[PDB]
Amino acid sequence: AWNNIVFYSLGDVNSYQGGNVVITQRPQFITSWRPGIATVTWNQCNGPEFADGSWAYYREYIAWVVFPKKVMTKNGYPLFIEVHNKGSWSEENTGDNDSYFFLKGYKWDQRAFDTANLCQKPGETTRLTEKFDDIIFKVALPADLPLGDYSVTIPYTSGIQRHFASYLGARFKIPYNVAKTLPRENEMLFLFKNIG
Structure with a gap:
């Protein structure tokens, strides 16, 4: 019995107003x-x-x-x-x-x-065609946040775990602590202006 697991990391930088x-x-x-x-x-x-x-x-x-x-x-x-x-x-x-x-x-x-x-x-590439749901987040601002324009870089990981195995019923999940340290090649550039 063998198991092959590969993680393909996506890396786009986009903005949200x-x-x-x-x-x-x-x-x-x-x-x-x-x-x-x-x-x-x-x-x-x-x-x-x-x-x-x-x-x-x-x-x-x-x-x-x-x-x-x-x-x-x-x-x-x-x-x-x-x-x-x-x-x-x-x-x-x-x-x-x-x-x-x-x-x-x-x-x-x-x-x-x-x-x-x-x-x-690592370093090898491929085209990923799969598309998944939006994830919507909120932001809590600190009360003493200075007024003005913000352009906040928010790095994060996204990608696909491909698991190839020899047998039927093979299950694998990259450990959270490993996933925790993966390169965060995606960037969400969050834009807003803090008023009163």
Whole structure:
């Protein structure tokens, strides 16, 4: 029995306009899943690296989003991040104090012969076409946050865990503490103006 797990990390930088906000309110921003070029940043393998189309293996794919619960403005003030709508994402390891963990398994126990690289190494790339739900977050502003324009960089991880296995019923989940330290190549640039 063998198991091959590869994590393909997406990395886009986009902006969201929060507009004028008063420090009492909890402004909203929408994180979108964007299909594109993904880069391997993690893997764990003990099986064959390559399938030639002539023999079967089993697929489990799981989408990941690892998102900060806290971000600092460039002028040194703390913003706290809350979930408003996680859609169909599975919000897990909720007791972690630094990061949210969202998972979405969209393929499991799928027998395939397809020719493929079953253990791509870090730095290798591929096109991800899969599309997943928006995740909507809120922001708590500190009461003494200086007035003016903010452009807050919020790094986070998103990508797909590909799990190839030798047998039917293979389940694997990248450990949270490992997922916790993965490169956060996505950036949400949250824009708003703090008024009164």
